[PDB]
Amino acid sequence: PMENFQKVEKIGEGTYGVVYKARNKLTGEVVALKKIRLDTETEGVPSTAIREISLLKELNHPNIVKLLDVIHTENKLYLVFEFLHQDLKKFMDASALTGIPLPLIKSYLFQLLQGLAFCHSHRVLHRDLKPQNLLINTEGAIKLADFGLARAFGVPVRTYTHEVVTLWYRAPEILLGCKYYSTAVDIWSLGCIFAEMVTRRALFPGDSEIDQLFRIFRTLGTPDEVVWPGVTSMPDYKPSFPKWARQDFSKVVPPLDEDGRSLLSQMLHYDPNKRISAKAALAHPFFQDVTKPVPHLR
Amino acid sequence: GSPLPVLSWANREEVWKIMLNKEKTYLRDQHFLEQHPLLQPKMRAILLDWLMEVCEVYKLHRETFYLAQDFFDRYMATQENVVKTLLQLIGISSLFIAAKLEEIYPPKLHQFAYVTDGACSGDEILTMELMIMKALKWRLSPLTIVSWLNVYMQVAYLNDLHEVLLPQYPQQIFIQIAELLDLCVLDVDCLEFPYGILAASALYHFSSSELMQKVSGYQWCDIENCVKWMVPFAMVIRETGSSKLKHFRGVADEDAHNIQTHRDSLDLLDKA
Numbered sequence: 147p148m149e150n151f152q153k154v155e156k157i158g159e160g161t162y163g164v165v166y167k168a169r170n171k172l173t174g175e176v177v178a179l180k181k182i183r184l185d186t187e188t189e190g191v192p193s194t195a196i197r198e199i200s201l202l203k204e205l206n207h208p209n210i211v212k213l214l215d216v217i218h219t220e221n222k223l224y225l226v227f228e229f230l231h232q233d234l235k236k237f238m239d240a241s242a243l244t245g246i247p248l249p250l251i252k253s254y255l256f257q258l259l260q261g262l263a264f265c266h267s268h269r270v271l272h273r274d275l276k277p278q279n280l281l282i283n284t285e286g287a288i289k290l291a292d293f294g295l296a297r298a299f300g301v302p303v304r305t306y307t308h309e310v311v312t313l314w315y316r317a318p319e320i321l322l323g324c325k326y327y328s329t330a331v332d333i334w335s336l337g338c339i340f341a342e343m344v345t346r347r348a349l350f351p352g353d354s355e356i357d358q359l360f361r362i363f364r365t366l367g368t369p370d371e372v373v374w375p376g377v378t379s380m381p382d383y384k385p386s387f388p389k390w391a392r393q394d395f396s397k398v399v400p401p402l403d404e405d406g407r408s409l410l411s412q413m414l415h416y417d418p419n420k421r422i423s424a425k426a427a428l429a430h431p432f433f434q435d436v437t438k439p440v441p442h443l444r
Numbered sequence: 445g446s447p448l449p450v451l452s453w454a455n456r457e458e459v460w461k462i463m464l465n466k467e468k469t470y471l472r473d474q475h476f477l478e479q480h481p482l483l484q485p486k487m488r489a490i491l492l493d494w495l496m497e498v499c500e501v502y503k504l505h506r507e508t509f510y511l512a513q514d515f516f517d518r519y520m521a522t523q524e525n526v527v528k529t530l531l532q533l534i535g536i537s538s539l540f541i542a543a544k545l546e547e548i549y550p551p552k553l554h555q556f557a558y559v560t561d562g563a564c565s566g567d568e569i570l571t572m573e574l575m576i577m578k579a580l581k582w583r584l585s586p587l588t589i590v591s592w593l594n595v596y597m598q599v600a601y602l603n604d605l606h607e608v609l610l611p612q613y614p615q616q617i618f619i620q621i622a623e624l625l626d627l628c629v630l631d632v633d634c635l636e637f638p639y640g641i642l643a644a645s646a647l648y649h650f651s652s653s654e655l656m657q658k659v660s661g662y663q664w665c666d667i668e669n670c671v672k673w674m675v676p677f678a679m680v681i682r683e684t685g686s687s688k689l690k691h692f693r694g695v696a697d698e699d700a701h702n703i704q705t706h707r708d709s710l711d712l713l714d715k716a
């Protein structure tokens with residue numbers, strides 16, 4: 147079963163299970179392994195595991211991290227993934243003084259949206275986009291990882307698990323207690339992360355659901371039935387919220403050309419209906435350089 | 445041909461095609477019970493009817509149900525020569541995988557053993573779930589018979605902003621159609637017809653080939669076969685009168701139509 151693989155070094159143990167970097171002895175093939183201890187489980191193979199497997203089976207794309215095999219031995223399951231060296235937070239951290247080249251920001255954001263555009267058209271939400279779950283290789287690629295909190299959406303979506311997404315990267319519709327939800331939650335994550343990449347500092351580091359909303363508001367402006375129909379009737383909306391003026395985006399992310407600063411605003415529209423899509427983001431002038439259009443049959 | 449409106453998140457044709465391309469990769473064989481020569485059709489029927497009952501009592505999702513069916517019928521066509529005794533375990537193992545997949549708060553392993561009245565214990569189920577999952581090759585994301593009916597019902601209520609995400613459609617009509625499919629599935633010859641069409645077919649029986657077409661895309665011809673095959677099963681639903689949407693105080697309201705249900709259907713499948 148596992149006889150060709152030499153654990154070289156462990157790279158992480160969190161909400162994912164265990165994860166060691168492996169060697170293929172005969173090949174010099176470097177993969178990532180996720181170990182799942184089956185014995186420990188009362189409830190058999192975890193819910194989160196059965197999902198992340200069958201999804202990644204049918205989510206083959208260059209900006210998604212690739213599942214390569216599934217191996218069962220001795221009351222231990224092994225997921226075997228395409229391997230990348232660094233994660234986008236430790237990178238963003240390493241380049242906290244120097245800045246990140248805007249060439250590379252743009253390039254990276256692009257590749258993420260292609261991954262997301264792929265998932266969404268495959269009718270799948272990530273629901274835990276965060277620099278920790280964005281992996282970069284040495285050839286300048288970036289790729290979505292960690293589909294444990296992902297979930298397909300029956301095109302007429304139904305009610306999904308309320309509390310998802312790490313607080314900071316979490317979208318105002320989930321915080322204000324929205325019933326149904328869809329693709330626009332992933333975009334807000336990516337928008338937080340764009341701004342992160344620019345300012346090498348998280349856009350909304352809330353220490354609570356209350357702090358997170360207020361931190362958002364202080365930057366985007368206390369929202370009303372104008373900028374976001376429904377907002378006022380929504381469950382965790384209180385008429386008590388203070389009022390803050392939206393701010394100039396030239397201050398909130400100073401380094402960013404109008405082409406960026408626009409894009410970002412549409413990614414952080416309050417109204418999920420109006421929020422930009424993955425596919426449409428690719429169209430934006432910001433990618434004028436990497437944008438190369440095609441024709442359109444009617 | 446795609447009956448989806450101009451989508452915002454992706455290319456309506458792109459989305460529909462992926463969905464279609466999916467219903468290939470996912471394969472079924474109406475005549476798989478010949479590889480198990482000692483196995484009879486009328487068996488499969490009673491098992492599926494059992495699973496429904498259990499799905500009801502635990503307020504499981506129809507979707508969960510159909511994931512069970514699908515895991516069963518796909519798995520068996522990877523197997524050879526199986527005994528009637530084994531089928532109680534293979535079905536409720538199937539369901540367990542689904543429940544884990546579809547519910548937020550799925551039932552616990554013992555409750556799943558429980559129902560077997562000893563004949564299957566949690567440890568057996570845990571072994572099975574793994575032979576099944578390695579035998580479908582971890583392909584547990586099929587578009588289900590009911591999955592389509594939800595699509596079609598949503599596409600039947602367009603309004604102005606062609607919003608295909610917020611479910612906006614009447615429960616009693618959904619329930620009434622489900623009832624017809626939830627039968628049709630008991631006879632193995634349905635695997636002949638793709639789930640797209642079975643769902644179309646049934647909707648036509650409660651509507652017309654004009655709605656069917658604007659919701660599904662399928663042309664009167666594409667279905668005629670299964671609407672011919674399905675005729676018998678329709679009469680019986682019509683003869684008895686069609687069901688009232690019930691409420692289960694566990695379950696909210698804007699989900700009550702999605703909760704799987706039961707009625708003898710023994711007497712009813714026979715009448716074809």
Ligand SMILES: CC(C)NC(=O)O[C@@H]1CC[C@H](c2cc(Nc3ccccn3)n[nH]2)C1
Pocket residue numbers: 157158162165178179180211227228229230231232233278279280281291292293
């Ligand atoms: C966020 C991640 C730890 N969790 C996760 O679910 O990732 C997937 C499963 C493992 C696979 C994977 C890891 C990997 N190396 C690295 C290198 C640096 C940082 C994190 N991981 N390369 N590929 C992808």
